Amino acid sequence: RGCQSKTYDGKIFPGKGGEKQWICKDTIIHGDTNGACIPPRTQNLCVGELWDRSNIKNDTKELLKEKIKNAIHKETELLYEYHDTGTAIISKNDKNGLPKGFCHAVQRSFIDYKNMILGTSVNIYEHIGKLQEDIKKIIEKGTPQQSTENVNAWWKGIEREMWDAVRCAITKINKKNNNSIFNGDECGVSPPTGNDEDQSVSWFKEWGEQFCIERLRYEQNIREACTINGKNEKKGDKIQGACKRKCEKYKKYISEKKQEWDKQKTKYENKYVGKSASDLLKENYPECISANFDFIFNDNIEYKTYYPYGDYSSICS
């Protein structure tokens, strides 16, 4: 049942809206994994074979494995379409001849599958949930007794194969264009690892890439509306028409993103002592280089007065 074209950042043209939004949950004690804000992509994860209610209550680990593989293959195929058509927010920016943001999206969904199966899934997500309980039962009955350790070992034992589903799907795309010859290793010869394993970090990094890309889109729109003629617009007396409109859209945007930033920044910096949320985003995404997060999301009252449009207050005046 299902696993259709993605819609998490809006439907693919001629499709209208249907976009999903980041869902932030109050993070209590976090000793193992978690994650503060759930990505729209994660909410659109192709589960189908696994769930819709669990559909693996009485399956064997071998059949569980084939379903996971099928889900991963389809997810990769669907994400390719979503970024290729330039519908995903992170694909809009610029563009092997892989669509912009596609590899990052696939890596993130792979990590989401891993965490959903290991039971170490950040915020107990509605659709999945009880799915993890049945996984543990299937594994416990299907493997030699030495419970969370057995599921972990099982995943490690099949991880290479699951990643090959991604590589295989990438090569299967070689039925479309001859602009590039995909060998399947474009998104990495091995699955994501390191800090990317921690779903909390993966989600925050995704939030940051999207945020920075949208910020640049607002900047371009602002520049086109506030800087023609020779220089001025709404410098003069106050902010005029088109320039004010674009600047106001940005102010509104930052206002909405502030809550998401605070929660993720706090969770990340408290778990990774010494490391800064700003560095994490700037070291990973080119789009975040020009973003001064501390300035953009400053809580001072003097800030909203002196800089009504945040970091773009000078272009907006």
Per the listing, tokens 């920075």 go with: 212
Query: Are 109 and 229 a contacting pair, CB within 8 Å?
Result: no
SS3 287: helix
Residue 10, token pair as written in the block:
């809006």
Class of domain 46-186: mainly alpha
Query: Are 67 and 235 a contacting pair, CB within 8 Å?
Result: no
Experimental method: X-ray
Query: Are 166 and 187 a contacting pair, CB within 8 Å?
Result: yes
85 Cβ neighbours under 8 A, 6+ residues apart: 12, 13, 91
Query: Are 162 and 128 a contacting pair, CB within 8 Å?
Result: no
Q: 192: closest CA among 257, 104, 273?
A: 104
Distance CA 199, CA 108 (A): 8
Distance CA 185, CA 166 (A): 9
* Length of the chain measured in residues: 317
Q: Cα 117 from chain centroid?
A: 19
Distance CA 112, CA 52 (A): 17
128 Cβ neighbours under 8 A, 6+ residues apart: 47, 51, 116, 121
Main-chain phi, psi angles of 6, to 5 degrees = -65, 150
Q: Is the peptide bond before 14 cis (omega within 30 degrees of 0)?
A: yes
Residue 61, token pair as written in the block:
């680990």
Residue spans of alpha helices (H) in 119-147: 131-142
Query: Are 51 and 14 a contacting pair, CB within 8 Å?
Result: no
Listed resolution, Å: 1.9
Per-residue DSSP letters for 88-101? SHHHHS----PPTT
110 Cβ neighbours under 8 A, 6+ residues apart: 72, 162, 163, 166, 191, 192
Domain limits, the chain: 12-45+187-317, 46-186
Q: Which amino acid is at 122?
A: V
